[PDB]
Amino acid sequence: GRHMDLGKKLLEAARAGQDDEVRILMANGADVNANDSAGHTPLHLAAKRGHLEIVEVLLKHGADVNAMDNTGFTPLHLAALRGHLEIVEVLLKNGADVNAQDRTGRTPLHLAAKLGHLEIVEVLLKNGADVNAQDKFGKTAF
Amino acid sequence: MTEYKLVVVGAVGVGKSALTIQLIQNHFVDEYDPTIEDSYRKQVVIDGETCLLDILDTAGQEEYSAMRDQYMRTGEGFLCVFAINNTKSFEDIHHYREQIKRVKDSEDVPMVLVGNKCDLPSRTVDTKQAQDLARSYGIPFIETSAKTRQGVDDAFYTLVREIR
Ligand SMILES: Nc1nc2c(ncn2[C@@H]2O[C@H](COP(=O)(O)OP(=O)(O)OP(O)(O)=S)[C@@H](O)[C@H]2O)c(=O)[nH]1
Numbered sequence: 001g002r003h004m005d006l007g008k009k010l011l012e013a014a015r016a017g018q019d020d021e022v023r024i025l026m027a028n029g030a031d032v033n034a035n036d037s038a039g040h041t042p043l044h045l046a047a048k049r050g051h052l053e054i055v056e057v058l059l060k061h062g063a064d065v066n067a068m069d070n071t072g073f074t075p076l077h078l079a080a081l082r083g084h085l086e087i088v089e090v091l092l093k094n095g096a097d098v099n100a101q102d103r104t105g106r107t108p109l110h111l112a113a114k115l116g117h118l119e120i121v122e123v124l125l126k127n128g129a130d131v132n133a134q135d136k137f138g139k140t141a142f
Numbered sequence: 143m144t145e146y147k148l149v150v151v152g153a154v155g156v157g158k159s160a161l162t163i164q165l166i167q168n169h170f171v172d173e174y175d176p177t178i179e180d181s182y183r184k185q186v187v188i189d190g191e192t193c194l195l196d197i198l199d200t201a202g203q204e205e206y207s208a209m210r211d212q213y214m215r216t217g218e219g220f221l222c223v224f225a226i227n228n229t230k231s232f233e234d235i236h237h238y239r240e241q242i243k244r245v246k247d248s249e250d251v252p253m254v255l256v257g258n259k260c261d262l263p264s265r266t267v268d269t270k271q272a273q274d275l276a277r278s279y280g281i282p283f284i285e286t287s288a289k290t291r292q293g294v295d296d297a298f299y300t301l302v303r304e305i306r
């Protein structure tokens with residue numbers, strides 16, 4: 001009842017970037033890995049939006065750093081897609097899988113290279129991203 | 143059951159996400175959150191048969207246009223949405239259609255034209271103009287409102303029938 005409802009508010013707070021509302025919801029027992037209907041966790045929404053503080057907070061609270069939404073994106077896919085560098089770094093220092101595949105086989109490197117995020121491509125390669133990784137169509141990142 | 147891979151495409155702000163969340167959760171989101179790429183899953187009954195809808199809700203924003211190829215390769219059917227007070231978004235159906243054809247190397251890809259926001263008072267895109275566009279393309283045309291829920295099931299269920 002309540003616990004489910006704290007999850008939905010945590011999702012909203014993580015998306016809308018309310019750094020302190022997040023801290024409260026957690027201490028009222030909210031689930032750090034609550035899912036929206038698209039399968040996003042709070043860490044996906046915070047990584048997507050570029051809220052570094054909220055990303056740090058969620059990880060300090062046991063957030064699953066390699067959680068996958070219904071498309072198969074991890075938070076590292078989301079941060080890379082939109083060029084959030086410090087987020088990409090922090091996710092990687094907390095054990096993010098650098099070669100995690102979405103449902104079509106795309107790594108974070110695939111998405112970063114697709115959208116031209118060159119600084120993300122470099123940081124990904126420094127962290128053991130595979131240059132020859134293929135998606136499910138046989139296509140590499142380039 | 144049979145799984146149908148449905149892809150919702152169209153310009154920024156036409157109601158792709160609001161249509162989709164109406165189908166899945168039966169509620170209308172008044173708030174714009176720009177979509178990158180979201181997947182939704184629903185087990186439904188269509189024409190008396192149980193099936194699963196695997197729905198991808200896509201980015202209208204042109205900054206993500208390089209991701210289109212990928213979802214055009216994977217989708218079985220495309221819900222081509224415009225808003226009835228958004229001339230540009232109607233005109234953009236052409237660009238979406240052309241890319242789909244090129245990626246599937248085919249002129250016959252399951253597709254439905256969706257004129258969204260039919261609850262709105264004034265409109266700049268004529269019903270006749272849209273009916274004509276759909277007849278040119280040889281595809282069905284459905285008028286929807288994510289706000290009232292009008293034509294929501296009809297639109298998705300119609301795309302399913304086109305995949306069959
Ligand atoms: N009046 C009315 N408003 C609608 C309807 N569908 C969506 N809207 C409104 O339009 C706005 C944008 O809708 P949204 O569903 O986010 O567009 P989108 O096509 O997903 O845009 P994007 O993610 O590619 S950037 C929202 O405020 C939403 O409430 C409708 O049928 N009628």
Ligand SMILES: [Mg+2]
Binds near residue numbers: 175176
């Ligand atoms: Mg959307």
